[PDB]
Amino acid sequence: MELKHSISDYTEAEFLQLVTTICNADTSSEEELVKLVTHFEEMTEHPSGSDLIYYPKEGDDDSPSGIVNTVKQWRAANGKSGFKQG
């Protein structure tokens, strides 16, 4: 079909949903849950990329938020393009 460009196409919330549909298992199964995570990778270029979900701190929460909250601060650290505008 046609996705977006990067974290700039999704806001901190719209993007948080993508990670939510991946860590929430609301897709057609784990498979669709991967294309959702890989997209997160090409989005915030983050270091873990698909790890933000497959690499939850040892004792933290893999939830989709703490995952979007960590990235949002990522670009602010690595100076990423950040999400869209809200």
* Complete DSSP assignment for 9-72: TS-HHHHHHHHHHHHTT-SSSHHHHHHHHHHHHHHH--SSTTHHHH---TTS---SHHHHHHHH
User: Rounded to whole angstroms, how far apart are CA atoms 40 and 7?
Assistant: 8
Where are the chain's structural domains?
1-86
CB 66 within 8 A of CB 12: no
The H helix count followed by the E strand count for the chain is: 4, 0
Local structure of residue 7 (DSSP, 8 states): T
User: Rounded to whole angstroms, how far apart are CA atoms 5 and 77?
Assistant: 21
SS3 state at 17? helix
User: Rounded to whole angstroms, how far apart are CA atoms 76 and 64?
Assistant: 19
Q: What angle do CA 20, 9, 17 make, to 5 degrees?
A: 10
**Fold of the CATH domain 1-86:** 1.10.1200
Q: Which helix (H) or strand (E) holds 70?
A: helix 65-74
